[PDB]
Symmetry: C4
Subunit: 247 residues, 4 copies
């Protein structure tokens, strides 16, 4: 059904292009503080700058392509919307493929642009010194939990009290996740964004954390919103049919 519709593939291309722009802008801001190359200064990474870069990139690209693709730009957000039965399995898989490919393309272009940097890690997510696998996993879980919870609540379609900009809300949620998680894990929070850096730098050490934790956080947010706090008066059988229908 969705395979033969041009609106679906425009949405997939929108996901690819917006993910590329998001990853490029955000990881470019994360690599900004290392410049100039020659100038030997005790340059310290600005966490507010990087968090605002990721968050405002999400806000701007959501404002740009929300009416076209839903402005997911995150495999965990897409999986959360899948488990809340809002999107089909095929749309979820195509969105995840598009997001990962767009992140890989953006990170390759960024490796080209930042070629003067020696030891260019391309913003690859890894555990800080003092944070082990479980602690970083919990960091990723909570960050993605708040993100997917905000995404689910913003698009309930039963809410008449909603006001203001939904893209701004999702962007500030991403920025909040970064303000939490940058000092602990670099704030993957987005499996495609971490996957692109891991692929380009050929380093997948502890990379399973940044795929497992965000998915657990998305599942927990789905459970919290759709089975504890704001349940829907609809049978699970009718909702599951969206997986094969997309309705």
């Amino acid at each position: 059904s969705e395979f033969k519709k041009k609106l679906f593939w425009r949405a997939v291309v929108a996901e690819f292009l917006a993910t590329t722009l998001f990853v490029f802008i955000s990881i470019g801001s994360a690599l900004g503080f290392k410049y100039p190359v020659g100038n030997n200064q005790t340059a310290v990474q600005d966490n507010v700058k990087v968090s605002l870069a990721f968050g405002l990139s999400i806000a701007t690209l959501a404002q740009s392509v929300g009416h076209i693709s839903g402005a997911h730009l995150n495999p965990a957000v897409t999986l959360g919307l899948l488990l809340s039965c809002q999107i089909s399995i095929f749309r979820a898989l195509m969105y995840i493929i598009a997001q990962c490919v767009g992140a890989i393309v953006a990170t390759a272009i960024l490796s080209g642009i930042t070629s003067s940097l020696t030891g260019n890690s391309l913003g690859r997510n890894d555990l800080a010194d003092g944070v082990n696998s479980g602690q970083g996993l919990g960091i990723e879980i909570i960050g993605t939990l708040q993100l997917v919870l905000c995404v689910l609540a913003t698009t309930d379609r039963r809410r008449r009290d909603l006001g203001g900009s939904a893209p701004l809300a999702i962007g500030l949620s991403v920025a909040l996740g970064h303000l939490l998680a940058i000092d602990y894990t670099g704030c993957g929070i987005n499996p495609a964004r971490s996957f692109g850096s891991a692929v380009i730098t050929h380093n997948f050490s502890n990379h399973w954390i940044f795929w497992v934790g965000p998915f657990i956080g998305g599942a927990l947010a789905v459970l919290i919103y759709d089975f504890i706090l704001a349940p829907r008066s609809s049978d699970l059988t009718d909702r599951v049919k969206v997986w094969t229908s997309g309705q």
Copy 2:
């Protein structure tokens, strides 16, 4: 009445979960600058980072659960809404219990994740050197006064001139309170959030400030908004019945 309504208990569970997420994300962001552990560096706390963490946490969680519970997430805001005769006594008590227990749970999990920090104060609010109990009390009073005043004016329901995101407004008020009070008192203003850190660290020195100042500030905000600036044309006899009925 409210005791036998499932929607009331959904709201209470929403307050518990959202306060847990708020405390965890905000204090974990406040503890970020102490990482890495092995790296001997004279790192300083970035106050904008922590203020934005608290503010955007409040804004995001308000967007998530405000239509479910009102998203108080602050015993001062709950007491202000009780004193403005908008909620019942039972709802206020259940909200305060849920917020405090959720804060304790979040701080326990956070001390679990940040166990590598030696002498971890877990974001416990304490007076800065040069500030006595009275000065920190005044700072807390003013921060809570502005926060509760913004909450009361945002939910007036007699206003048609409101626009934009009310969760964003309340979050930016929380961030304003933090931009004020982080340097002076570690920025409490939320008695549950202070209480969780005090319980986990087993340290209650000067803890009366962060329960008295927020309550005085909330009560003063109620007085200002309901009996100086925006009086209601209702007898107090009708408004008192909201305490026992919850209407």
Copy 3:
């Protein structure tokens, strides 16, 4: 006419209280980086923190009391709205008196709170090294010009394309003014806000700038909006009657 109305004096008290809260919170955030007092550290003032403090203070207080008083909180803004003939002369006079008194009271209370700071300037506005009277005057004129222009455009009442939060718009304008002018003059931008610090510290050197420049900027913004960009097709004789009628 307005002398014998309860709503008029409620608005005046709202202006007084909101100016008190604004001056207190913002200047207290400006002084925060000096704490702890005992610790001998070369901490540097964070311009983003102070600018966000002023801006979020204006935004929060506008969201609180704009429906009551209009949330001017600035003698330059009040003078601009008088020259654009939106308020009466008596309302402008009482608003400016209330704003100055509130700033004086807030600065007194904050000086009481920040007594342990030796050589405390209380955020007194003065020129930096390398900036003479003319350059600081120009910076103040431009900052207040953009502030008053935003206020005039946001309250046009002929506009149907206005969206989002007007208090947030005015607050971000104030934050922008501080981002421009903190390094040059400390960003007076607000004659009452500087007048309070000058009165409490008993230092009026170069203080004519912060009462001349903001008023010039307000008058220029009135000229730009009401006579160049979006003129009103109403007689100047008719708009004169607003000064003595308020309608």
Copy 4:
């Protein structure tokens, strides 16, 4: 036709004045970290401060002159709106002339105000060390691509899912571009902004980047939004008539 209309010339004057205010305030905030002059301190530029200055200046001036001129304030945005056939060729040319002249005027006044800085580059855009022409070109292309894409998607007039403040959305897009590109190229992103600095400082080294890259980014944004993501159901022949008609 449009040459003799009062509203057209009001829009042109609004573009000139708002571009003057934008350039002045943003580049004044950019040069502020070098003050005080006498104090010998190793001051480091705050990228968040300058990025927020640019973005909030764009948001405030859009809120001020959007209903009069559309608030481009950027030759790349004007070129994008021309190529998407939203304005005429005459309007676009007059807008670009006004923006360049306003940037020149603002930079001249600012060099008058920042005269005490020795070797004052007036925030002139140039490549950082480690960045050659291709890398800076790519950075400028991507930043302007995201900006123009956000502008095109925001002013669509076919969308009913838009909420919040469009000026704030465009301002956050500008701030995001600066957060990305300040460390690499100073974030031209705006050919008029770079042009004024280059003209006043009499230095055009690599100045072609900040005219070509923004225009390439705007053209790519127009291509992406109009012929990949959200095509319009009209013939190109009908849309071309806007170039000579303005309707």
